[PDB]
Structure formats: structure tokens, C-alpha cells
């Protein structure tokens, strides 16, 4: 885990959250798994129908699943969202609500995605990674693929534990698309380090 130094809430924070838009189904799992954060770290997830939220989500379709990381909604004006779910439904199972939902509240608690860890040195085929994302389904260009994936943090603006593969904060990667034969599975669930590392970040 990874979190940027800069973006860190207060610790002990209730961070509003408020929910526009959704299914009663897809908003109460939103919730569901985003409190799931609060049995480790020393932070707290208040969905709120009142007032201003800090963390306000949304559910455009199409739009792509993200989030601001962290105290970065505080920029964000209040006719926006700071984060948007864009594929849920009311067919979507629980293994895809804990996989996502945890992992974009994840970035709402300031952490950044473990592939692009300041401790890492991931062995991508660069080629074959241009090569598949530059078509169906991402259609990526080469300031995407650089940006999201090649590019790491470094060690001196974020607070880190060690890289681990299984975090929720870690997307998959084939090992057709490395020189290595190395890979990351689909990670749905809190890894260990994540329970720990988090708690480390928002210590009680
Ligand atoms: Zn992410």
C-alpha cells in the first residue's frame, strides 16, 4: 500500500459522503463495502442526505470507475463528483461491488495504485502493453499507458508499507503482458498489508 503523504486526511476525520443517483441495491452496497475501510484505519465513512458532503459519488454510466485521492475533493467543486462508479447495475455481485467500491474508497483515503508503487520496478513488455491497449476495450493512447501504468511514486511524497501484489489497490496484470512471467491475479478483497498498512496510515 501506498498512500500520498499530501492527500492524507485528519486522523480520526468522518469524512461525509453522499450518494447521487443509484438503485436503493447498488447504493446500499456502495456503502456496505466502503465502510469496510473502518474496521482497520482510524477513519470514518458518514453517508449523509443533508448538506455538503466531502465526498460526493455518482453513478454515470460509461463514465469509468475513479476517484480523487483523498484531501483532493477539497478542490472539487461542490456541482461535482469526486468520485463516480460506472458499471454497476442491479445484477452486479458482491465479489465486483467489494472489488471496486473498496478500491475507489481506497484512493478517497489517499492511496494511489500499487502498481505504480515508489518501491516497485513492475517488468513490463512495453510493446505488447501499447499493443493492447491501444485497442478494445480501453483504446488508450501512449500519455495514458505511460501515465497510468509505467509511471511509479516516489518514496520521498508518499508514506508506503512494502509492495504488495495482492492489494485492493493493485490491478490485474497477464503475464502476456510482461517480459517475466510474472503476474497479479484479481484481488476483490483487503489483503493483509492492506489491513495493517491502512491502519498504520490512520492509527487508533
Ligand atoms: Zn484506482
Known amino acids: 500500500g501506498a498512500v500520498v503523504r499530501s492527500t492524507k486526511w485528519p486522523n480520526g476525520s468522518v469524512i461525509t459522503?453522499?450518494?447521487?443517483?443509484?438503485?436503493?441495491?447498488?447504493?446500499?452496497?456502495?456503502?456496505?463495502?466502503?465502510?469496510?475501510?473502518?474496521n482497520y484505519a482510524n477513519?470514518?465513512?458518514?453517508?449523509?442526505?443533508?448538506?455538503?458532503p466531502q465526498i460526493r459519488v455518482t453513478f454515470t454510466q460509461g463514465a469509468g470507475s475513479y476517484s480523487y485521492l483523498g484531501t483532493?475533493?477539497?478542490?472539487?467543486?461542490?456541482?461535482?463528483?469526486?468520485?463516480?462508479?460506472?458499471?454497476?447495475?442491479?445484477?452486479?455481485?458482491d465479489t465486483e461491488f467489494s472489488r471496486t467500491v473498496i478500491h475507489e474508497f481506497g484512493h478517497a483515503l489517499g492511496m494511489i495504485?500499487?502498481?505504480?508503487?515508489?518501491?516497485?520496478?513492475?517488468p513490463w513488455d512495453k510493446n505488447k502493453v501499447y499493443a493492447y491497449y491501444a485497442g478494445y476495450p480501453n483504446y488508450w493512447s501512449k500519455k495514458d499507458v505511460?501515465?497510468?501504468?509505467?509511471?511509479?511514486?516516489?518514496?520521498?511524497?508518499?508514506?508506503?508499507?512494502?509492495?504488495?501484489?495482492?492489494?485492493?489497490?493493485?490491478?490485474?496484470?497477464?503475464?502476456?503482458l510482461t517480459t517475466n512471467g510474472f503476474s497479479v491475479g484479481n484481488n476483490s478483497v483487503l489483503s493483509a498489508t492492506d489491513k495493517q498498512f491502512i491502519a498504520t496510515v490512520y492509527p487508533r
Not at 113 to 122: D, K, R
Open 17 to 38: 459522503v453522499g450518494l447521487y443517483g443509484g438503485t436503493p441495491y447498488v447504493r446500499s452496497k456502495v456503502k456496505q463495502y466502503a465502510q469496510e475501510w473502518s
Open 43 to 52: 477513519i470514518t465513512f458518514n453517508f449523509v442526505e443533508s448538506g455538503t
Open 72 to 93: 483532493q475533493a477539497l478542490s472539487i467543486p461542490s456541482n461535482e463528483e469526486t468520485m463516480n462508479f460506472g458499471w454497476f447495475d442491479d445484477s452486479t455481485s
Open 113 to 122: 495504485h500499487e502498481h505504480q508503487h515508489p518501491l516497485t520496478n513492475i
Open 146 to 176: 505511460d501515465n497510468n501504468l509505467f509511471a511509479t511514486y516516489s518514496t520521498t511524497q508518499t508514506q508506503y508499507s512494502a509492495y504488495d501484489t495482492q492489494s485492493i489497490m493493485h490491478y490485474s496484470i497477464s503475464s502476456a
